């Protein structure tokens, strides 16, 4: 049977683009498309796609459940058996829902997190989708209670493959392949097992307005970047790590609150070290 | 004699042709004994030698979970490698890993191994000390820094000193009468004319295990190592191997040529001649 795929993603915004490819007998040409209900009726009045089918700009009419058949001249029927099914989901058709993490977006290796999607729009289903190429979304039925619909996606035990930027979508009854605008994104980061860095203050954690204080994140491990986080959920500051003469790796964040720092590496933004011990800065 | 266990992983992307695929195979010496292939409808680690088949269900369940996890891990590593090398997600790439242990006659560890490759060239390898890495390029140097920060080598060392040795010993016992009993080659020489001044003499070794063997041609006692055609040792398909060695000889000089065969299954090295 052929292998059908959507590129770059089967989850695609209205106005975007997605291409279906039907790989069969070591070629990408000569195939027909079918949608789930009509199984022996080729779409587009039996159009024989001469190459990959580019849908662009994407409209809601593109949303659907597809299979392909590849040409097979020297066989009983003209064509192959049906491919695996690919569901093109078109986003941007309803107000966006909301996505939050419980207890939070930084998840220790091996542990679990809940990603809750919710909306005051009644969505029949919710979809959770991690940003990237060729990734499948998770689906859950929405549950109604006190004027909202919502779903809980459980993620874990936490590892790198599960880390990244997540968005959630709702779809409403009778248009299951049409998704809402995406929720605001949530970066879910895995912490550990890389060794925790050290956090310190210069000249010290006691400061009174208006004099300068720099926090330094340091490690013997060759971290490429440091992330400084202050309890209370404003997004971490980031700085490149610099190698010092005694071979430690350090970044200096010139700035109260309770802080922690994490190390990370090049090309790897969603996996961080264990958190440093906390440091309390007072003004 | 000394023995080895090795696992070999191949993880491949193939955008537009299929889902990424992960295949693992396990060998004791030259004998494959397990396989796992992510493409199977319901993938499981499966026996590929008879002496492992009676291992209990807890073994298979355990090996299967690990391979499923490993498949997942390596799918992500392919993605990571793309970022390290600034390559497009349209291209097809391969990660290969081999790891395992060698033990001596007393069953004790001689050497541990853990080597990885990206697109068929060395990427990163655990050193003989089992506590440090050799990275082949700048991309691999990122991985090295992660692994040092995560104390990966300690974990690998613990595996190599412990479970690896322990399981190899178990398998060697389970399969003793095949794995630990060398089968000597059956040998013969054939003669094939080339012109009416020259001919080929071919020395054959068949049905031997293990694969290690030496076939040499001598001419009045001097090796013709410069004028010998040596074919790659090849599997017979029944867990034995085959090889031949050929030499072009002048007509009427067949009698000065002797074929010499060395293999552990042979009591004394063999000396054959065409007749």
């Amino acid at each position: 049977k052929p292998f059908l795929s959507a590129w770059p993603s089967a989850v695609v915004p209205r106005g975007g683009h997605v291409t279906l490819r039907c790989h069969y007998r070591h070629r990408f040409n000569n195939f027909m498309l079918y949608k789930e209900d009509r199984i022996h009726i080729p779409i587009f009045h039996g159009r024989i796609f001469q190459e990959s089918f580019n849908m662009s700009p994407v409209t809601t009419a593109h949303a659907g459940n597809y299979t392909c058949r590849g040409s097979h001249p020297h066989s009983p029927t003209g064509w192959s058996a049906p491919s695996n099914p690919v569901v093109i989901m078109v986003t941007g058709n309803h107000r966006k829902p909301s996505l939050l993490a419980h207890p939070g977006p930084l998840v220790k290796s091996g542990e679990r997190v809940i990603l809750q999607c919710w909306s005051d729009i009644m969505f029949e289903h919710f979809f959770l989708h991690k940003e990237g190429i060729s990734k499948d979304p998770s689906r859950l039925v929405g549950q109604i209670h006190d004027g909202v619909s919502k779903a809980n996606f459980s993620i874990g035990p936490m590892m790198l493959a599960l880390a990244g930027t997540y968005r959630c979508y709702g779809s409403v009854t009778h248009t299951p392949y049409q998704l809402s605008a995406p929720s605001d994104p949530l970066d879910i980061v895995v912490t550990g097992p890389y060794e925790k860095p050290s956090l310190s203050a210069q000249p010290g954690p006691k400061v009174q307005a208006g004099e300068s204080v720099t926090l330094s994140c340091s490690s013997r491990s060759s971290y490429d970047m440091y992330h400084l986080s202050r309890e209370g959920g404003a997004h971490e500051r980031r700085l490149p790590a610099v190698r010092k003469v005694n071979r430690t790796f350090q970044a200096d964040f010139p700035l109260g609150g309770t802080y922690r720092c994490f190390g990370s590496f090049r090309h790897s933004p969603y996996e961080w070290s264990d958190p440093s011990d906390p440091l309390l800065v007072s003004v | 004699g000394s023995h080895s266990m090795r696992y070999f992983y191949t993880a491949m992307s193939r955008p537009g042709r299929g889902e990424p695929r992960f295949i693992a195979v396990g060998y004791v010496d030259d004998t494959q004994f397990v396989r796992f292939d992510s493409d199977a409808a319901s993938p499981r680690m499966a026996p590929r030698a008879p002496w492992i088949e009676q291992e209990g269900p807890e073994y298979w369940d355990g090996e299967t979970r690990n391979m499923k996890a490993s498949a997942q891990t390596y799918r992500e590593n392919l993605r990571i490698a793309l970022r390290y090398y600034n390559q497009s997600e349209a291209g097809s790439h391969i990660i290969q890993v081999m790891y395992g242990c060698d033990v001596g006659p007393d069953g004790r560890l001689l050497r541990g191994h853990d080597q990885s490759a990206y697109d068929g060239k060395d990427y990163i390898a655990l050193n003989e000390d089992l506590s440090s890495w050799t990275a082949a390029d700048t991309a691999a140097q990122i991985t090295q820094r992660k692994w040092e920060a995560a104390r990966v080598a300690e974990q690998l060392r613990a595996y190599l000193e412990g479970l690896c040795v322990e399981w190899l010993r178990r398998y060697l016992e389970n399969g003793k009468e095949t794995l630990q009993r060398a089968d000597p080659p059956k040998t013969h020489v054939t003669h094939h004319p080339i012109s009416d001044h020259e001919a080929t003499l071919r020395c054959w070794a068949l049905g031997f295990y293990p694969a290690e063997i030496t076939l040499t041609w001598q001419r009045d006692g001097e090796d013709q190592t410069q004028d010998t055609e040596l074919v790659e040792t090849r599997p017979a398909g029944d867990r034995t191997f085959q090889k031949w060695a050929a030499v072009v000889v002048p007509s009427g000089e067949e009698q000065r040529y002797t074929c010499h065969v060395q293999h552990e299954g042979l009591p004394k090295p063999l000396t054959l001649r065409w007749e």
Binding site: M159, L160, E271 | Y7, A24, G26, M45, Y59, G62, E63, N66, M67, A69, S70, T73, E76, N77, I80, A81, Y84, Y99, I142, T143, K146, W147, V152, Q155, L156, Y159, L163, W167
Partner: peptide
């Protein structure tokens, strides 16, 4: 396990 149980990311 007989195979390496530790999961190792690049």
């Amino acid at each position: 396990t007989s195979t390496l149980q530790e999961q190792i990311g690049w």
